[PDB]
Design a protein around this ligand. Structure first.
Ligand SMILES: CCCCCC/C=C\CCCCCCCC(=O)O[C@H](COC(=O)CCCCCCC/C=C\CCCCCCCC)COP(=O)(O)OC[C@H](O)CO
Lengths: 235, 10
């Protein structure tokens, strides 16, 4: 199989035009931000990563035509999954099994997570690394990644929105694009599309666990005041 | 009710 080249669905070509290179997001967040892991700094880093995701959504086809109430509902249903997918893809590209790469460029040894993290977080980090391994084995590429981000953003049943038609059409176009692209570019991975949808089931499971970790921190009064992920958690 | 999310989208 091989990525890109000819025969790429229009939706995917459009999404690639809206996806910043990792180096550019890094610079932006390091700019917005400025031993034991610095907890509040990492919380601010995750908030800034979500702000970057909201900026991407704002520019996307379809999403940019929706009224604010529909935009908020979509993001309220997808924020945690978009953050998990962003972290997972960053690891797939990084390609190191003994460390994790943060959006700031910081590298964190997994041995350090075993020393510093409690059980909820340690288990979550390791479960996420298993999905990273699966996606690397499946040869997840950038075309698939951006389509998966769009699919998640638009994952909500349209009955919860004012503009049913536009979002339903976006859902259908994104599923068709991922199916067409994977079949044409990875013909010998015959069930790649289904395998990516099963990977999204795992992103949702990881997201739920991440929400439970944030809720435990919130009840313990450990989160910074006015944290954006907690606002999303309570919405 | 003003929220951070609404401020990001406006
Ligand atoms: C999908 C796996 C990623 C994990 C998602 C975690 C959920 C939300 C993100 C919150 C952002 C801030 C993370 C801060 C992590 C941190 O500092 O952890 C420390 C331990 O620090 C370490 O183990 C080394 C640093 C590990 C840093 C991991 C950072 C992950 C960064 C970005 C991922 C963004 C994806 C967010 C997904 C959110 C979905 C809801 C404190 O651990 P603890 O909370 O278990 O407390 C134990 C005891 O009380 C002593 O303190």
């Amino acid at each position: 199989g091989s990525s890109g080249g000819p025969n790429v669905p229009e939706l995917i070509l459009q999404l690639l035009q809206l996806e910043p290179e990792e180096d550019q997001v890094r610079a932006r967040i390091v700019g917005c931000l400025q031993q034991p892991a610095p907890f509040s700094l990492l919380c601010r880093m995750a908030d800034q990563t979500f702000i970057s995701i909201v900026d991407w959504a704002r520019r996307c086809m379809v999403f940019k035509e929706l009224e604010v109430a529909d935009q908020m509902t979509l993001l309220q249903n997808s924020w945690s999954e978009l953050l998990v997918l962003d972290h997972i893809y960053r690891q797939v590209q990084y390609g190191k099994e003994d460390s994790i790469l943060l959006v700031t460029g910081q590298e964190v040894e997994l041995s350090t997570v075993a020393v510093q993290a409690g059980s909820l977080l340690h288990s979550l980090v390791l479960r996420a690394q298993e999905l990273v391994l699966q996606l690397h084995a499946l040869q997840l590429d950038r075309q698939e990644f951006v389509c998966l981000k769009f699919l998640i953003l638009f994952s909500l049943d349209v009955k919860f929105l004012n503009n049913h038609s536009l979002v339903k059409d976006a859902q259908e176009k994104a599923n068709a694009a991922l199916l067409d692209y994977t079949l044409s570019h990875y013909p010998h991975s015959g069930d790649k599309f289904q395998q990516l949808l099963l990977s999204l089931v795992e992103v949702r499971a990881l997201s739920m666990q991440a929400k439970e970790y944030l809720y435990h921190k919130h009840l313990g009064n450990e989160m910074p005041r006015n944290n954006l992920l907690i606002e999303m958690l309570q919405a | 009710r003003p929220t951070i999310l609404y401020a990001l989208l406006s």
